[PDB]
Amino acid sequence: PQDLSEALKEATKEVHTQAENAEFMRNFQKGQVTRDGFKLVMASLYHIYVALEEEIERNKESPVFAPVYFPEELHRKAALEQDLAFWYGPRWQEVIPYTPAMQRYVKRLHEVGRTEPELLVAHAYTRYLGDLSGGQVLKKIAQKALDLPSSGEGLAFFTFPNIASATKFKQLYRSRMNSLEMTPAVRQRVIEEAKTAFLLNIQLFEELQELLTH
Numbered sequence: 001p002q003d004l005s006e007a008l009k010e011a012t013k014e015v016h017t018q019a020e021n022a023e024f025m026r027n028f029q030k031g032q033v034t035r036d037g038f039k040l041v042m043a044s045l046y047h048i049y050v051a052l053e054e055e056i057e058r059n060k061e062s063p064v065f066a067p068v069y070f071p072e073e074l075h076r077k078a079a080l081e082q083d084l085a086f087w088y089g090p091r092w093q094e095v096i097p098y099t100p101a102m103q104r105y106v107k108r109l110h111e112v113g114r115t116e117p118e119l120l121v122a123h124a125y126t127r128y129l130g131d132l133s134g135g136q137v138l139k140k141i142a143q144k145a146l147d148l149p150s151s152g153e154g155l156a157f158f159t160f161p162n163i164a165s166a167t168k169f170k171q172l173y174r175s176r177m178n179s180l181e182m183t184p185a186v187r188q189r190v191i192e193e194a195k196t197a198f199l200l201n202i203q204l205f206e207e208l209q210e211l212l213t214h
């Protein structure tokens, strides 16, 4: 369509369903998520956001990204650090896994941020708008299945404290995305990069599912 935000949503409808159908995600949705499985998901998110946010900081003043730069409202690294200290303990940095599928995702994020910055918006869209939009449903399931202790920690990732209304922010973020100026060639590569982002998540899900079935 005309608006990039609408173009992205329509172009990734197929791959989003592919993600919903992923065996690992099917189990999650059926409420069949285990503590070991959830831990792997949180570790994955930590590596992904560390890379994404490092690249966002590198390109925050570039015209290809500045319009969608919302550090305070969206940053997730600190929240994940808090969560991993709960899930993996005080020495989480020394024990969290960093698997090949996690590395493939991180590698692409760095390649984009360092050599193809104009495509970073595709990854910011896929991750941020995705976790913002589906965070409520994804969290509700986890907490009711994890039966975790009332220790007030472990799920900070699912709350964006600097966004008072997800509805208002998503409209603003979409408006900013649509304000970005890019050639038709770039626009097509951004759309493709968004699909690539979903595929990287899907391959990660497949790897995690394999690691858990031994």
Ligand code: HEM
Residues within 6 Å of the ligand: 005, 008, 009, 016, 019, 020, 025, 028, 029, 125, 126, 127, 129, 130, 131, 133, 134, 137, 197, 198, 201
């Ligand atoms: C367990 C599987 C998943 C569930 C159940 C889920 C759920 C949701 C929900 C409820 C929405 C809101 C749709 C609407 O009402 O307009 C959504 C949007 C979205 N999701 Fe997911 N999601 C899943 C996996 C993923 C994955 C793996 C990604 C990518 C990392 C992702 C990226 C997105 C994006 C980018 C949107 C924004 C759509 C837009 O442009 O409006 N989701 N998701």
